[PDB]
Structure formats: C-alpha cells, structure tokens
Design a protein around this ligand. Structure first.
Ligand SMILES: [Fe+3]
Length: 271
C-alpha cells in the first residue's frame, strides 16, 4: 500500500530515520547529497514534497535557516525537532557567537538521542507500525553504540597535545569534544560572512605554534581556503571530511555510520 511518508530537511536525518522506519515507511530528504544545508534555498517542488508527507523531521538548533519560513507554506503536516533534549555547544566566535552549534549528530552518543526522538515521532504519528519502529530503533542504537570502541582505537595513535582538528567550517565541535580534540576552523558556521580572509591568517599562526600536521575541508563547501592554509604552512591538506551531507548511494559515504567512520578514518590518516 501507500506507505507512511517522512520528509526530512537533509540527508543525515533521512538515513537515521530510514533505519528506524525499515520497510514500513518511506523517508526522503529535501536537500540532495552534496548540497549546502544551512542556507539552502527551497523551491516550489520542495513545498509539494513536504506537503505530501505524513511527518516532517528537522534538526532545529537553527541548522536550517530556511526551514521555519518554508514550513509556513505546509498545512496539516506534523513536524518534530530531532535534537530535542540535546545540550548544545555554543558557537564560540563570529557573527553567530553564542548561538547553538547545530552539528550535534557528529557525536554518536548524541545520535542515540536523535534516534529516540525519531522513534517517538514515528510511533506517535504511525501507531500501526509502532512495534517495528521500536524494534528497528533499538537495533540501530546498538549499531551506533558499537562504533565507540573502533573509533577511539582508530584515533589512539595521536597523542593528546597533538590532537588538533583543523577544518574549514567549525562543524566538528561535538565530535572533537567526544574524542578529546582541540578545534580550529576557518569559519565558525556556514553563512555569507566576513572575517574568513583574516581568520585564515590566525589559523596559520596556530598551526605554526603547535606544529599541526594536517588541515581539512568538508564535502558541501569549497576546499580552496584549507588548501591555501596548507600551502602557507608546514601542514598537509588531509582531504574532505563529511558532516553536513551524505554522498550519493554509490558514493563513499552513503549512510550516517559511514559518515562518522570515514570522517574519523580521514582524520586519523592525516596524522
Ligand atoms: Fe555545517
């Protein structure tokens, strides 16, 4: 029959929700793999897609600067914020200083809270399949819990004072806290903004003082600033990390678990 339909704002939530839904519901993302999610510009096709859903999931913590305006065009579709109950880390500098850092899913322990909020919403709005959602959610939570040991072991060759995570967007604060990294970034959160040219200068100073070997970019933004930082410092360009989007289904990062694993693997490789 016509399955229960879930529409999410972006792809990370889509993949977590589809694991809870199983074959009982269809989960689709508004944004496409690779697309920039903070300042995404919704289209009329997106309105129809969201309006066709039985349930809409979004991150909150003002990740989707577009969502609240967009949702005003949607009628009679329930929504749920999937970061309910997560304690935010605040943005530390720049024009969004003090706002929640929205990238909470980069902590796998936070992902357990994402999972519970999505399970609750699915059970509430599709009670006919509650037993499947509950079974799937507990099974998926166990797979997330099983990542912690291999993740920490993968990063264990890097001594503490050397654990510096230099990226483009400061999107990794929750992962960095979880695994004991100090964070440096070229801009605090994706946005149209000033201060990136002069922040590139400051990051160049921090790398030299701390002999940081590697700097990274991310899959939905330009690698040019991080590549420039590598050329003006003694640091390697360690490649592309994944945070704001999955890849395509055939790509290297088709799932949330693969995103966490590949990002940690890529960091580890860089040292
Ligand atoms: Fe981001």
């Amino acid at each position: 029959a016509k399955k229960f339909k879930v529409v999410t704002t972006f792809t990370i939530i889509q993949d977590i929700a589809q694991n809870i839904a199983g074959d009982v519901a269809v989960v689709e993302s508004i944004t496409k793999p690779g697309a920039e999610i903070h300042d995404y510009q919704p289209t009329p096709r997106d309105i129809v897609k969201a309006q066709s859903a039985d349930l809409i999931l979004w991150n909150g913590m003002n990740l989707e600067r577009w969502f609240e305006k967009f949702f005003e065009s949607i009628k009679d579709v329930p929504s749920a914020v999937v970061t309910a109950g997560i304690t935010p880390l605040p943005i530390r500098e720049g024009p969004y200083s003090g706002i929640a850092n929205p990238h909470a899913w980069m902590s796998p322990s936070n992902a357990l809270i994402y999972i519970e909020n999505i399970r609750k919403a699915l059970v509430e709005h599709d009670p006919a399949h509650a037993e499947t959602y509950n079974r799937n959610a507990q099974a998926y939570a166990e797979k997330i819990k099983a990542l912690d040991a291999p993740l920490r072991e993968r990063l264990s060759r890097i001594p503490a004072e050397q654990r510096w995570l230099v990226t483009s967007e400061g999107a990794f604060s929750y992962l960095a806290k979880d695994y004991g990294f100090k964070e440096v970034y070229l801009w605090p959160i994706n946005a149209e903004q000033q201060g990136i040219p002069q922040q590139v200068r400051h990051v160049i100073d921090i790398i030299r003082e701390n002999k940081i070997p590697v700097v990274f970019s991310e899959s939905t933004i330009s690698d040019k600033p991080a590549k420039q930082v590598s050329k003006e410092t003694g640091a390697q360009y360690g490649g592309v990390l994944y945070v704001d989007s999955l890849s395509g289904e055939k790509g290297p990062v088709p799932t949330y678990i693969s995103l966490i694993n590949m990002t940690v693997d890529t960091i580890a490789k860089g040292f």
